[PDB]
């Protein structure tokens, strides 16, 4: 939509550009049904869009992690994402900036699966953490689920309209698409590094095009 596109462009221009371009993937799960979450112990049903299914989320996290570990050969050298990414905490923490709904779950399979309850009921899980985080992306403490943070170790709040698409109004839980975005240095003032970055981007494009997961359709822009 035009409104969301305007919001994203303003966010990327402020927080990444002019030194960084953005790589962006749109991920859908067209063969996955939407579902209904029923809060414990009672509460109105909360609809969740197709790609917010827990198995789809694990599969998208695997896609994200795979992307971070892509390398490219250039002049017999190995070029990594960490060479060309935005890494605010370097040299301490050399992790790259990469935005997705998995950011709300520390980009972790185990955290995504966090839950509490008894032998019969689950009291809280990723559903309630999601609903909380899309209303308070800057929170470092979800009291209803084990004090798990929404906000990541660096980068500032991840607004849901950066990482979700296809919902109605501002009902983010009805998202029909996931968005993965990460900045890559344009190296406007260094031809050698620019050529290496382009070698990485070319391998990324090829990676995406050859990615095999029957549950996901991945597209660019």
Documented resolution in Å: 2.0
> DSSP letter at 141?
-
What value does the CA radius of gyration of the chain take, rounded to a whole number of Å?
18
The values of phi and psi at residue 64, to 5°, are -55, -45
Rounded CA gap, 168 and 174, in Å? Answer: 7
Domain count, the chain: 1
- SS3 (DSSP) at 78: strand
DSSP letter assigned to residue 47: E
- Give dist(CA 30, CA 216) in Å, integer: 7
User: For residue 187, with 0-12 CB atoms within 10 Å meaning exposed, 13-18 middle and 19 or more buried, which class applies?
Assistant: middle
Per the structure, the complete domain to which residue 118 belongs is given by 1-221
Rounded to whole angstroms, how far apart are CA atoms 209 and 221?
Answer: 14
CA 186/CA 166 separation, integer angstroms? 30
Contacts for 176 with CB less than 8 Å, ≥ 6 apart: 28, 49, 50, 51, 165, 166, 167
User: Is residue 192 helix, strand or coil?
Assistant: helix
């Amino acid at each position: 939509p035009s409104s969301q596109a305007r919001l994203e462009k303003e966010y990327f221009d402020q927080h990444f550009g002019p030194f960084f371009r953005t790589e962006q993937l749109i991920i859908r799960a067209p063969l996955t049904d939407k579902h209904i979450y029923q809060p414990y112990p009672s509460g109105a049903d909360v609809p969740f869009g197709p790609p917010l299914d827990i198995q789809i989320l694990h599969q998208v996290l695997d896609l994200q992690i795979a992307i971070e570990n892509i390398t490219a050969s250039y002049d017999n050298e190995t070029v990594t994402l960490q060479d060309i990414c935005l890494a605010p905490l370097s040299p301490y923490n050399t992790n790259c900036t990469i935005l997705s709904v998995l950011n709300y779950f520390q980009n972790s399979h185990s955290v995504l699966d966090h839950k509490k309850g008894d032998d019969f009921f689950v009291y809280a899980d990723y559903h309630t953490h999601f609903l909380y985080c899309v209303r308070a992306p800057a929170s470092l403490n979800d009291t209803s689920l084990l004090h798990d943070p929404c906000l990541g170790t660096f980068g500032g709040p991840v607004f849901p309209w950066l990482v979700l698409g296809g919902y109605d109004d501002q009902n983010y839980n009805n998202a029909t698409a996931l968005v993965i975005t990460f900045p890559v240095n344009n190296y406007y003032n260094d031809t050698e590094k620019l050529q290496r970055a382009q070698a990485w981007e070319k391998e990324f494009i090829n990676f995406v095009k050859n990615y095999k997961n029957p549950n996901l359709t991945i597209s660019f822009t």
